[PDB]
Design a protein around this ligand. Structure first.
Ligand SMILES: OCc1cccc2c1OCC2
Ligand SMILES: OCc1cccc2c1OCC2
Length: 147
C-alpha cells in the first residue's frame, strides 16, 4: 500500500487525513511518494540530563529534562517547516553534537555504524527528507537525509 513504515491517521483538530511514519516520526498531509549501501545525513541533536554523556560544546553540564529537550526539538521542526529558519542554521547554532561545526553533516555511513534508531530513521528517509524527533541514547535528533 504505502512505503516502508507509513500509516494513515486523522487530525484531531481538523478531521483531515494525514500520514505518519513510525520509523522516522515524520508526519505530512500528502500521501507518500511511490535500499542503498550507504546514506549521508545531517542532524541536530538536543541532549538532556539522561543522555549517555550529558555535556556538549554548548554546555559543560546539560541539565534540561528529556521533556524539555523534546519541546526544543519540536520548536526547531516548526521553524524549519515554516521556512522561518533553515535546518543548517539551527544545527550550527543549537545542536549539542560537535557536528554543529559542519552544519550538522555526519557524512556517509552504512548499517551497523550508528545507534539503531538513528540508523533506521536515516535509511527510511528518502533523499532530501527530514525526520521527526528520533530518540537515541545520545538524546533527541532531527535527521536530514542529504544523499
Ligand atoms: O561531519 C562529521 C563531523 C564534523 C565535525 C565534528 C564531528 C563530526 O562527527 C562527529 C563530531
Ligand atoms: O568523520 C566522523 C568524525 C567523528 C568524530 C570526530 C570527527 C569526525 O569528523 C571530524 C571530527
Amino acid at each position: 500500500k504505502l512505503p516502508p513504515g507509513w500509516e494513515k491517521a486523522m487530525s484531531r483538530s481538523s478531521g483531515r487525513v494525514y500520514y505518519f511514519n513510525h520509523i522516522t516520526n515524520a508526519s505530512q498531509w500528502e500521501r507518500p511518494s511511490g535500499e542503498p549501501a550507504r546514506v549521508r545525513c545531517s542532524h541536530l541533536l538536543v541532549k538532556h540530563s539522561q543522555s549517555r554523556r550529558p555535556s556538549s560544546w554548548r554546555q559543560e553540564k546539560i541539565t534540561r529534562t528529556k521533556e524539555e529537550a523534546l519541546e526544543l526539538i519540536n520548536g526547531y521542526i516548526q521553524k524549519i517547516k515554516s521556512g522561518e529558519e533553515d535546518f543548517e542554521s539551527l544545527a550550527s547554532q543549537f545542536s549539542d553534537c560537535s557536528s554543529a561545526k559542519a552544519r550538522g553533516d555526519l557524512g556517509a555511513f552504512s548499517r551497523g555504524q550508528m545507534q539503531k534508531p538513528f540508523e533506521d530513521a536515516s535509511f527510511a528517509l528518502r533523499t532530501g527528507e527530514m525526520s521527526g524527533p528520533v530518540f537515541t541514547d545520545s538524546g533527541i535528533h532531527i535527521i536530514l537525509r542529504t544523499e
